[PDB]
């Protein structure tokens, strides 16, 4: 159901990629029930540095919206639907360790919206990006009703999902949907290259800041600057700073 | 100072055009309160399922900026024209049915911040866009000191007011004060085609996501996901998720 | 360790420079304490109208990342440094001129914070806006997390913390972190032709527009229109509501 392994300098990087390139990687409850043990619900191990996630294929990241079709059941199930949802994308967006997102193509419907749970996006050249749910007669529900409005601010984010429809990698990559562009027969290289310069660093600098960074955004300016000091003496309890 | 068309597909367009081509459509109190009236008051027909808005002439979206200035008298009656000015554009901007800024050239002042209430602005080439208020001796009252930091950010509303210029279509799209730059005059033959392509998907699935993107515009993230599931509920007890 | 140096039409234009070339102008805490005690004489002088703050040659703003590196204190006057450090920057951000920080080549570290804590910032191609805090340790304690993520985002802010790489400050331009372009002969042009777009307004408009802008972000809109409100009516009883519309 999925796939995974871990390699860099002294073993501090690995891969978590979802394995169903037969239904263009779509993500069902049985898929969405492991990745959540996979990030072991906010709390890695000692031995990776940075986490990278993609989709194995090469076509599309997780495209659930052309054969994902299933609800025909009870409205009050919806809440457990909508809830499982929430669930890994959270584990996804507050994981121990950051992990940098690697859009392989098509990316619709929860793909999409599971790829905006992670910190840094480097997308392929062929990608196809969008939250199209309406069209079926849905409003997005696995979280993105509040992460398109958190990234690329609300004037785009009232675009995409009123219409459904999907924009070029390069139009995601001028409004912020996507932060860097790298070609598709670069990508399972540079998707590394960023994280091989990622785990070179301080390993308890980079995962305070992630704290004091994703929890100071529901807060406002003033509360999150005593927030950012408990982390900043934080580091200096450890002595990473002082080598 | 007002018209209603229905000229479209679906029968469900009912853009609001301003009456007033010898002054560039701008705004006072007597047009103010008629647009509630047009938008009656949180509530419009069951037929019309999406709007767009733009300036009769196709001269001027709306100038309310400088040329329409009636405020030299009693600080304690322009505590009205504000909130005149905030029942208006919040009445816009929280529609039964989304909108669409068609801006066809000028659109400045208390005009421009009616353009900022809408949730999809489509520009114009010819588009004028700006805040000057201070050069006239005012800090922007109707959300021109709200709405312009949400859209474009907070580090591209410091330059428009504290300097107010008349930046130009080009430099508009460049920051996100229009989500799209598209031509002037096929405002009407795109956003129409734009709207068609909004009314083609299903309603239920368009306006339970207004109620939740609008709502959770300044809440905490965990709260916004408390919105969405609701309005994600919403959508299961209708006729418009099985057939 | 500075200089005020006022000028413009009737003089009230200002161009705090910071004066320390030996270290590229050094961010240590009687520089961290040096520019609260003359801003808050500035914010207690009404004559001057806008405000510039920079370095002085053709260099760079303030490299206090990888020049300046103190951390050696018990974990217990390190609060106090966060607490000095985020002093000085609340001090900028809340002055009663507007600042237009104009950066000046190397913004990283305590100049980055800093220069992030004004209002308008131009930046160059040559300049370098990056946080390298976290490769030695500390994660950017005077603002870095949370004042990079409400400028530019949360999805790009996230890369510039994390990475500790120094982006091209043309890069800035299209991140969005930064305001203008031009190429580098005079930013005393430019910078200072704004200033006068700026002291060509009204006095209280832009400031009541100010403590407006810098408290309605947080909360709610709802409860941002109440400062809203509250501050259009203070530019009415003052006389430049009756002299400029004519």
Same mark, same amino acid.
């Given at each position: 159901?999925?796939?995974?392994?871990?390699?860099?300098?002294?073993?501090?990087?690995?891969?978590?990629?979802?394995?169903?390139?037969?239904?263009?990687?779509?993500?069902?409850?049985?898929?969405?029930?492991?990745?959540?043990?996979?990030?072991?619900?906010?709390?890695?191990?000692?031995?990776?540095?940075?986490?990278?996630?993609?989709?194995?294929g090469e076509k599309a990241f997780s495209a659930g919206?052309?054969?994902?079709?299933?609800?025909?059941?009870?409205?009050?199930?919806?809440? /457990?639907? !909508? =809830?499982?949802?929430? @669930? $890994?994308?959270?584990? %996804?967006? &507050?994981?121990?360790?950051?992990?940098? +997102?690697?859009?392989?193509?098509?990316?619709?419907?929860?793909?999409?919206?599971?790829?905006?749970?992670?910190?840094?996006?480097?997308?392929?050249?062929?990608?196809?990006?969008?939250?199209?749910?309406?069209?079926?007669?849905?409003?997005?529900?696995?979280?993105?009703?509040?992460?398109?409005?958190?990234?690329?601010?609300?004037?785009?984010?009232?675009?995409?999902?009123?219409?459904?429809?999907?924009?070029?990698? /390069?139009? !995601? =990559?001028?409004?912020? @949907? $996507?932060?860097?562009? %790298?070609? &598709?027969?670069?990508?399972?290289?540079? +998707?590394?290259?960023?994280?091989?310069?990622?785990?070179?660093?301080?390993?308890?600098?980079?995962?305070?800041?992630?704290?004091?960074?994703?929890?100071?955004?529901?807060?406002?300016?003033?509360?999150?600057?005593?927030?950012?000091?408990?982390?900043?003496?934080?580091?200096?309890?450890?002595?990473?700073?002082?080598?």
């Amino acid at each position: 159901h999925m796939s995974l392994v871990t390699t860099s300098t002294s073993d501090g990087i690995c891969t978590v990629k979802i394995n169903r390139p037969d239904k263009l990687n779509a993500m069902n409850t049985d898929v969405a029930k492991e990745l959540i043990k996979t990030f072991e619900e906010l709390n890695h191990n000692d031995d990776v540095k940075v986490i990278i996630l993609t989709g194995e294929g090469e076509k599309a990241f997780s495209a659930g919206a052309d054969i994902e079709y299933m609800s025909k059941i009870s409205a009050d199930e919806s809440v /457990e639907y !909508a =809830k499982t949802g929430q @669930l $890994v994308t959270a584990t %996804v967006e &507050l994981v121990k360790q950051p992990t940098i +997102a690697a859009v392989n193509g098509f990316a619709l419907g929860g793909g999409c919206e599971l790829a905006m749970s992670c910190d840094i996006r480097i997308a392929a050249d062929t990608a196809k990006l969008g939250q199209p749910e309406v069209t079926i007669g849905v409003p997005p529900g696995w979280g993105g009703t509040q992460r398109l409005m958190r990234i690329v601010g609300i004037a785009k984010a009232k675009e995409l999902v009123y219409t459904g429809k999907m924009i070029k990698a /390069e139009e !995601a =990559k001028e409004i912020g @949907l $996507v932060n860097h562009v %790298v070609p &598709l027969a670069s990508l399972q290289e540079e +998707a590394l290259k960023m994280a091989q310069q990622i785990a070179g660093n301080s390993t308890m600098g980079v995962q305070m800041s992630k704290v004091a960074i994703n929890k100071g955004r529901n807060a406002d300016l003033d509360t999150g600057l005593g927030l950012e000091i408990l982390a900043w003496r934080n580091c200096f309890t450890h002595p990473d700073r002082q080598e």
